[PDB]
Each structure stands twice: as C-alpha cells, then as structure tokens.
Design a protein around this ligand. Sequence first.
Ligand SMILES: Cn1ccc2c(ccn2CC(=O)Nc2ccncc2Cl)c1=O
Ligand SMILES: Cn1ccc2c(ccn2CC(=O)Nc2ccncc2Cl)c1=O
Lengths: 128, 128
Amino acid sequence: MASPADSQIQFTRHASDVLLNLNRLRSRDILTDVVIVVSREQFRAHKTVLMACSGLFYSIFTDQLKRNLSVINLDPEINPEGFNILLDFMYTSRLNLREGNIMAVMATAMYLQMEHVVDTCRKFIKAS
Amino acid sequence: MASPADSQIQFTRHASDVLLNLNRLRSRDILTDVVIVVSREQFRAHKTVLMACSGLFYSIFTDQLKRNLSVINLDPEINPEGFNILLDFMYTSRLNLREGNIMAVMATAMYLQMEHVVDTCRKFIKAS
Ligand SMILES: Cn1ccc2c(ccn2CC(=O)Nc2ccncc2Cl)c1=O
Ligand SMILES: Cn1ccc2c(ccn2CC(=O)Nc2ccncc2Cl)c1=O
C-alpha cells in the first residue's frame, strides 16, 4: 500500500521555508554540531546542511572515521571571505558574486566540491 | 561592506536539492539525533528538520531543558500512519492526502502545530 511522491500534493514553498528556518537555527547556534576553522576565523554550522551542499563535507562526514568531528580546519590557503559567502549560499540559495570576490569564491567552491556554483562562477567570468 | 540577499544570484533548485539530500541522510540514518516513538512504531529524524517544519517540535527542542532529548514519546492517541505521512512531507514537500487517511493526517498536523498543512487538509475536505 503506497502513494508515490509524484501523485502527492506539492507544497511549492516548503523546501525554501525549511532552509530559511535552518538558517534561523544557525543564527541562534541551535543544534550546530561543527566549527569550521578558516585561518583566523571560525564558522559554526549543521553537518547535515554542509553534507547536503558540498562534496568535500559530504565525503568527510559520511566516513564513520570523521562523522563525529566537532572541529574541521580548512586548508590554510582558503579565503575566509570566500568560505563565508559560500556558507551563506548553502543556507539561503543566494550567492553573492562580485568582481571583487569572484576568484576567491570560485577557488573556494572548487575546494568545497560545489560543481554547480563553480559552473556559475565560470558564467560570471564569461559575463565580465 | 555588504551584499543584501535580495541583490544576490538566486539558485531556484538549491532549497529543494538540500531537502532531498537531508531525506537521503535520514534514509541512511546519518546524523539523525532523535527517535520519535508513536505507539508501537519508531521513526528516526534530524531535530533541525523537525523544528523547521513543526510548532510542536520547535517548542520542545528550542527549550534548553529538552534540547538534548534523544527520544520523544508522542501522545498515545496519535495515529502512526498520520505521523509517518507528515514526517515524509517534512522531508519531501509532498503530502499524501487520501479519503482513507485525511482525518488521521489532519488530527496529527493539529497536534504537530503544522498550520499550513491543517489548512490544506480543510481544503481537501471542502473538495470531497
Ligand atoms: C560534485 N559534488 C558533490 C557533492 C555535492 C555537490 C553539491 C552538493 N553535494 C552534496 C551531496 O550531494 N550530498 C549528498 C549526496 C547523497 N546523499 C546525501 C547527501 Cl547529503 C557537488 O557538486
Ligand atoms: C503554527 N506553526 C508554528 C511553527 C511552525 C509551523 C510550521 C513550521 N514551524 C516551525 C518553525 O517555524 N520553526 C522555526 C521558527 C523560527 N526559527 C527557527 C525555526 Cl526552526 C507552524 O505552522
């Protein structure tokens, strides 16, 4: 006895509402379970959201060896501004690309294994 | 120095992709942190997603007194089928309403404090 997801009532704003509420929990540090250290800066997040948005974080936390880490030290060459823009993106679906930050954002998205964002960065370069 | 979310590049499928990947993590029991007990049945979930989708779970886990609970026993009158349909909805944006399940689903959504789903249930009744 079943009901295929395809025949069910679609709530067109549900996914966007969930992501906005996850961002609100991040803003209040509710159930955050990791600190991402990026040179002199620290960013708290939900490992579930990191894994949902990044090949790097997916590959780290899917491994039972690293599943329970509370601190991740990113590569020391990663631009914290680049990382912060992408973390915002993960929690908002909005990507802040500017002439001043495109190379930092693109290099960081390559490291985080966010292929659709890297492609978008290549589109932004083609448009400037 | 800032960039308002409103002037930023919108990824129209990002929120839906995040929610599908959270559902995949739930399907593999990766970083689930609660068991919801509903009479004879048990359902594992992510407290962050429960809080994002339900006034009842928001109010429970926002309280530092209950923030760390690993087990929630729902009211013994809650229909496990009703609960399972709504948990699926939380993780998919798809709501399985049928003549056979509408009253169970609506009663459960009232208990979970999911006002937009209760309203939709009232619309389904008006249409049958
Ligand atoms: C190249 N690459 C690799 C991974 C990736 C992206 C963009 C987002 N993600 C995360 C992801 O797929 N997570 C995931 C996949 C299956 N089950 C659960 C989860 Cl959480 C990417 O571009
Ligand atoms: C009546 N009612 C109450 C709550 C509710 C719904 C539907 C989803 N939610 C969850 C929610 O708002 N969560 C939330 C709010 C602020 N900051 C973080 C989070 Cl996570 C509802 O219909």
